[PDB]
């Protein structure tokens, strides 16, 4: 839900969801209080190498 457009007029602003639209199976994992899959400046598989 972090990747959704924050400038859109969502029915539920906090959840960034619209009434009646299909809900992802793993929505509770993605509620943006939680796991974030948003694109990063540096690639994955490059951050891991540097950190390790």
């Amino acid at each position: 839900q972090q990747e959704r457009d924050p400038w859109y007029d969502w029915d539920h602003p906090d959840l960034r969801l619209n009434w009646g639209e299909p809900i992802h199976w793993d929505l509770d994992m993605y509620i943006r209080n939680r796991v974030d899959t948003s694109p990063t400046p540096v690639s994955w598989n490059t951050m891991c190498k540097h950190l390790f």
């Binding site: 539920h12 602003p13 906090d14 994992m29 509620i31």
Partner: protein, 459 residues
């Protein structure tokens, strides 16, 4: 102890003879008086138990359980009268009759001096609970929930009956005092192994042990609020009480028959705590919480140390109070919005601040914030397990972290954020609901002030 039994039997015709508009008032007042009377049972001795007669006795393990039962009756009465307003007078009286009969059976179960009488009462507690669930539940899943609740219990309890009558034919008595004084060790044979299993599995399924708990989410979600209160607060503790009673005759066989149940308890504790992290129904989360806490209680009973028994007693009392409070908190929102989905109604702290404070205190006691009796029990059990084996701390440690995570997840999902825009029927909290929450929470801290009253006979 007929001075407590007889007043409840009098609650029965008092309810059935009351005016149509005074049943709740009369039942609540006299239930509270009976609780005050039962408060006298806390004056216990240091060496033996209070032996009232040939039939009833009171120990330092059963007195807090009796007090909890008698205190839980009025709270259930207050919690039930909201959603039963449109019901007819006769059916309301029948509901109160079911609750009174359940209390009477529970009171007699915790003080029976013989194991067969204890069995008969501990099995008689089934009928009122099943009737309540299947008659006054809301959804069509209540019938299946009642079937699951009945058969899971009976399939464990019938071998216990066979084992009990066999033991009485062998040793000549089932009286608990005689059983304790004339105890003899159990050899290592297949007959003794199956006797152990028959004496243990019914209480295991009552806790319930992980893998045998599938009935509990169904029954505790599909029941009405009073049913959920009494199922979580008192009826799960029958297994723990019975297990601590029966383990007297199971030594030294337990020394190795406890391994599968210990592994199941620890790993399934981790699993049920993890399950609580992805739950869309708010009541199922509280049910799985109960499963995790009861797994801890099972571990404590199985390792058989004084510290583990003290921790088990304290944890059972604390969990009863906390889980009943959490169920009532969820039922308030359900009555407001007629849905159990957790992410439907959000930002409720903005609309209901005092109810948010009650939510915060309940979820703080759920995660065992010190010096609550929840943490006293949990820490005693953890220390006993560490003495049993130093590697349990890892599993125990993981559980503590997970419990905090899902408790605060529930709190943040329900109370914080922004209120859903379309829901405009969230009325202010009634005085009844606030009084219910206060009567749940104040005894917890009061008991924290004097913790030797819930630490059991091993104190």
């Amino acid at each position: 102890m007929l001075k407590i039994i007889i007043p409840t039997t009098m609650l029965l015709p008092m309810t059935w003879m009351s005016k149509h508009n005074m049943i709740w008032i009369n039942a609540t007042v006299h239930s509270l008086l009976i609780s005050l009377i039962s408060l006298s049972l806390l004056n216990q001795l240091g060496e033996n138990s209070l032996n009232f007669s040939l039939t009833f006795f009171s120990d330092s393990l059963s007195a807090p359980l009796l007090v909890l039962t008698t205190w839980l009756l009025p709270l259930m009465l207050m919690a039930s009268q909201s959603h039963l307003s449109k019901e007819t007078t006769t059916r309301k009286k029948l509901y109160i009759t079911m609750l009174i009969l359940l209390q009477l059976f529970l009171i007699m179960t915790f003080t029976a001096t013989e194991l067969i009488l204890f069995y008969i009462l501990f099995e008689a507690t089934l009928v009122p609970t099943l009737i309540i669930i299947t008659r006054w539940g809301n959804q069509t899943e209540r019938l299946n929930a009642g079937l699951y609740f009945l058969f899971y219990t009976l399939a464990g309890s019938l071998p216990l009956l066979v084992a009990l009558v066999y033991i009485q034919n062998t040793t000549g008595s089932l009286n608990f005092l005689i059983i304790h004084y004339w105890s003899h060790p159990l050899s290592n044979s297949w007959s003794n192994i199956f006797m152990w299993l028959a004496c243990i599995m019914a209480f295991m399924v009552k806790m319930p042990l992980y893998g045998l708990h599938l009935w509990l989410p169904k029954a505790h979600v599909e029941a009405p609020i009073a049913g959920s209160m009494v199922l979580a607060a008192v009826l799960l503790k029958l297994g723990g009480y019975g297990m601590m009673r029966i383990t007297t005759i199971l030594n030294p066989l337990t020394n190795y028959m406890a391994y599968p149940f210990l592994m199941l308890s620890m790993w399934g504790m981790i699993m049920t705590s993890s399950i609580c992290l992805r739950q869309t129904d708010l009541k199922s989360l509280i049910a799985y919480s109960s499963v995790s806490h009861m797994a801890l209680v099972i571990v404590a009973i199985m390792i058989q140390t004084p510290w583990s028994f003290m921790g088990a007693t304290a944890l059972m009392i604390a969990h009863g109070l906390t889980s009943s409070m959490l169920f009532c908190l969820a039922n308030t929102n359900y009555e407001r919005v007629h849905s159990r989905t957790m992410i439907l109604a959000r930002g409720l702290q903005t609309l209901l601040p005092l109810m948010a404070t009650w939510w915060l205190v309940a979820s703080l006691t759920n995660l065992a914030l010190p010096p609550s009796i929840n943490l006293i029990g949990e820490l005693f059990i953890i220390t006993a397990s560490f003495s049993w084996s130093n590697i349990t701390i890892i599993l125990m440690g993981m559980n503590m972290m997970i419990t905090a995570l899902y408790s605060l997840y529930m709190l943040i999902t329900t109370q914080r954020g922004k209120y859903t825009h379309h829901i405009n029927n969230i009325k202010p909290s009634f005085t009844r609901e606030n009084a219910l929450m206060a009567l749940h929470i104040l005894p917890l801290l009061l008991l924290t002030l004097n913790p030797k009253m819930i630490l059991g006979p091993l104190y």
